[PDB]
Design a protein around this ligand. Structure first.
Ligand code: HEM
Ligand code: HEM
Ligand code: HEM
Ligand code: HEM
Lengths: 141, 146, 141, 146
């Protein structure tokens, strides 16, 4: 569970992301594709080339969803229900891949927010992504 | 493999007693039921709405036999699973888009089916050697992913 | 989330275990130690040899806790508070390990409850062990 | 260890810019803070009650530097990690009883640390090379477990 501290940490670091969320979402995806190539099996229909608009497009959607979870940090299960259903029933992404993306998202933020990416913030952001992943995977079976 | 002659013989000897037809259909079926998301690759098989519908689906059973067959033949090249599954590794990557994590889910299901079938015979030391083989197989199959 | 069918399946299967749970606890550990030798790092103080009373006793302890969990399948979090505490703040076993013991437990049940280890029951027990795993690692951070 | 020549040059060029003293302390400190369960091996280190207590603990800093010291040496023998890390693997197993999963957590933390420090210089492709490396090191450190 996320503590008040965590909550403050996340709103703060995400606060800084602001308008770059979309681009950071795209970048986390590319990092993931390059470091964990097995994740590509889920996007056979995508142009995964550098600067692919499909990836750009996708990065934004993911960032929008994270932004929405931050806005509803106290009711994530409900704020993300629809996305939980989609992933459980249609996409059927194996659960292990959530940890991979989470990891690439953390690397992206670190790379962009040197001043805010403190030990404390890092830990809060990691618990946060773990919680988002748990929600998205809750309806799998 | 990092199989001990003793470990090799145990694997080999239990396998000799296996009905691939039955074990193949049961392993794949149990997979589809325990880990529902693995069904994303078998939409064309039909109705997998229930344990019963999965366990009974002939397409499932027949796919199961094909998979354990290939597995079975790999036990003959236990000293080069890599070379034995190369082509199958590319296929799974490039044509099927199967996440290699699935190879590990199956392996564990396989071990549960064997324990199920052999009771007493499937001892801790025997499971240990089989765990090494299933891992080995999954690694070989995942080897050509890019 | 354990469905009613699941809760039923579990209570039935565990029902058949009866006076052998302790022996099955012991057997699952033995299978874990041999199949996943990295798990032994948590028991340096034990005699991990076959038939060790240390291993036997621990086997009962684990079995017992599972029993209590089946019994309170509706209130696991509460039924296992203390155990969740112990693991998070004292033992501090890495979360990956819970999946290994869970697996050795299925294998043991399967080998001992042929008739009862149906595909539907297998699925339920797995979810159950997963739930139990979540509970035991919920206070880690 | 599928390090292409170009991946190896990239690992090496960046490693040239690292202050192992500093990176070592940050990586270790951050692990104890992010995954507090890992604190189980350091009860003799004193106060690890808060982030500042961890990050600033002279013992954590000193150990971090030692750990990264051994890692840096590993980077000079990318060809023979197993050999390079063999006595250390044995020690971690037999004397320290350190669950190898700990080696993979540290690797991920380390990647975040390099990202933190190098910013934009830690490109998608450089991260992918480092990912292969931390995994190879974790594997080498676990090779002697039994
Ligand atoms: C916290 C992590 C994640 C978030 C927030 C997330 C969110 C989303 C969103 C918002 C969409 C678009 C749905 C729509 O069409 O409106 C989506 C689609 C998708 N996601 Fe997830 N996702 C996550 C993890 C993953 C992972 C780890 C994978 C696989 C490696 C994945 C694979 C997919 C796929 C294949 C689609 C469909 C894309 C398309 O066809 O356009 N997702 N996700
Ligand atoms: C022990 C591991 C496995 C082995 C040895 C194996 C082997 C095979 C073989 C020999 C084929 C025949 C296809 C051909 O030659 O054209 C096949 C096809 C296929 N496999 Fe795998 N497989 C394994 C695991 C899996 C898993 C776990 C999945 C998904 C859950 C999977 C999904 C498929 C699919 C979708 C096909 C194509 C069947 C069709 O054409 O309808 N495989 N596999
Ligand atoms: C299925 C999940 C598990 C359950 C229900 C469980 C239950 C228990 C119980 C009932 C105890 C004894 C408490 C006491 O001594 O009063 C215990 C202790 C312990 N458990 Fe857990 N356990 C689980 C998973 C694990 C795993 C996966 C590991 C490590 C691989 C582990 C490591 C330990 C250790 C080291 C002890 C203390 C041993 C001793 O010094 O006596 N546990 N656990
Ligand atoms: C890159 C991975 C690692 C490397 C290269 C490494 C290297 C080392 C070295 C060189 C030593 C000193 C050996 C000696 O005392 O003779 C050491 C000791 C130690 N390591 Fe590791 N280490 C690694 C990861 C870890 C992790 C992740 C942990 C725990 C989470 C850990 C726990 C310990 C402990 C507890 C000691 C002994 C400290 C003491 O003196 O009390 N190591 N390690």
């Amino acid at each position: 569970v996320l503590s008040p501290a965590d909550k403050t940490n996340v709103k703060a670091a995400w606060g800084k992301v602001g308008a770059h969320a979309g681009e950071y979402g795209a970048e986390a995806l590319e990092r993931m594709f390059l470091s964990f190539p097995t994740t590509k099996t889920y996007f056979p229909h995508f142009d995964l080339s550098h600067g692919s608009a499909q990836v750009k497009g996708h990065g934004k959607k993911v960032a929008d969803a994270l932004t929405n979870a931050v806005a509803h940090v106290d009711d994530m299960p409900n704020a993300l229900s629809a996305l939980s259903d989609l992933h459980a029933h249609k996409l059927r992404v194996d659960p292990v891949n959530f940890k991979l993306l989470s990891h690439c998202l953390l690397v992206t933020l670190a790379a962009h927010l040197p001043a805010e990416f403190t030990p404390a913030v890092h830990a809060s952001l990691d618990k946060f992504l773990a919680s988002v992943s748990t929600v998205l995977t809750s309806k799998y079976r | 493999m990092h199989l001990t002659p003793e470990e090799k013989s145990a694997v080999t000897a239990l396998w000799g007693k296996v009905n691939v037809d039955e074990v193949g259909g049961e392993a794949l079926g149990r997979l589809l039921v325990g880990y529902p998301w693995t069904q994303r690759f078998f939409e064309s098989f039909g109705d997998l709405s229930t344990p019963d519908a999965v366990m009974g689906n002939p397409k499932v059973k027949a796919h199961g036999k094909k998979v354990l067959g290939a597995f079975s033949d790999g036990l003959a090249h236990l000293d080069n699973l890599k070379g034995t599954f190369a082509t199958l590794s590319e296929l799974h990557c490039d044509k099927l888009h199967v996440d290699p994590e699935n190879f590990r889910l199956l392996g564990n299901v396989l071990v549960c089916v064997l324990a199920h079938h052999f009771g007493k015979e499937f001892t801790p030391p025997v499971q240990a050697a089989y765990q090494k083989v299933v891992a080995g197989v999954a690694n070989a199959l995942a080897h050509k992913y890019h």
